[PDB]
Write a protein that binds this ligand. Structure first.
Ligand SMILES: Nc1ncnc2c1ncn2[C@@H]1O[C@H](COP(=O)(O)OP(=O)(O)O)[C@@H](O)[C@H]1O
Ligand SMILES: [Mg+2]
Length: 228
């Protein structure tokens, strides 16, 4: 059996700390249901991100394969920062299958893709959410040339601008073994979390993703075990 099943599997096989476990189970739990056991676990993840580091100003969230729960982690972890009084920007950096816009119920007409090429403005592309201190930069329209936008100069410089006025930036991404989008993001965003599907995963896949992220220069803060 190739599956990574727990904190011990994680430490031995990946040499990273488990920063939080989310149980299996209407999606923004930290907001909609602040009293749930699952919400507290997200606040625990925020706590462990703080112990893991220096302080975390930019965070990339990724996984080895689709469906791991990247997006759910991004959304909820971002909310725990906002409610703690930090100015927080979620960037939906998944321009292949954008999803933050559905999660927060915001319109994805302008977003990252069109911001990068300059077809929209910062004020236009960034939307304030219903959660105080939490802004959302949706993915924008799905571009033909994602790799090219991510590796661009406007992106690196937009991140720098954003980080002048946001305490923390949390960036959702496409799976690592699927496309190289996350590795490219690692140029502008050094710190990262790896989200693992506890019920369904391959030890070797997760190692490859970790190696790929480490090769792109990413500081992997730790792992989130999901659907445990
Ligand atoms: N802890 C969990 N328990 C149950 N379902 C989950 C959990 N985390 C994510 N999901 C579900 O799994 C699906 C994929 O999650 P998502 O975060 O969108 O995947 P991705 O890793 O591709 O971003 C979603 O429909 C979501 O509701
Ligand atoms: Mg997703």
């Amino acid at each position: 059996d190739k599956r990574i099943k727990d904190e011990e599997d994680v430490e031995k096989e990946l040499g990273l700390p488990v920063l939080g476990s989310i149980q299996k189970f209407t999606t923004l739990f930290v907001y909609e249901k602040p009293k749930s056991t699952i919400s507290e676990k997200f606040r625990g993840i925020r706590s462990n991100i703080m112990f893991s580091k220096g302080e975390v100003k930019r965070l990339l969230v990724t996984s080895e394969k689709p469906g791991a729960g990247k997006s759910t982690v991004v959304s909820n972890v971002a909310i725990t920062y906002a409610q703690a009084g930090y100015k927080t920007l979620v960037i939906d950096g998944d321009m292949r299958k954008p999803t933050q816009n559905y999660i927060f119920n915001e319109q994805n007409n302008n977003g990252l893709s069109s911001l990068i090429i300059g077809r929209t403005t910062m004020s236009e592309a960034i939307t304030s959410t219903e959660i105080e201190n939490l802004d959302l930069l949706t993915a924008g329209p799905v571009p033909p040339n994602p790799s090219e936008l991510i590796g661009s100069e406007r992106f690196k410089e937009l991140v720098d601008l954003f980080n002048k006025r946001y305490d923390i930036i949390i960036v959702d991404t496409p799976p690592v073994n699927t496309v190289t989008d996350a590795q490219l993001y690692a140029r502008a965003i050094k710190d990262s979390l790896l989200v693992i599907d506890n019920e369904k995963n391959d030890k070797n896949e997760v190692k490859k993703a970790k190696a790929l992220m480490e090769k792109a220069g990413s500081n992997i803060l730790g792992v989130i075990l999901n659907k445990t």
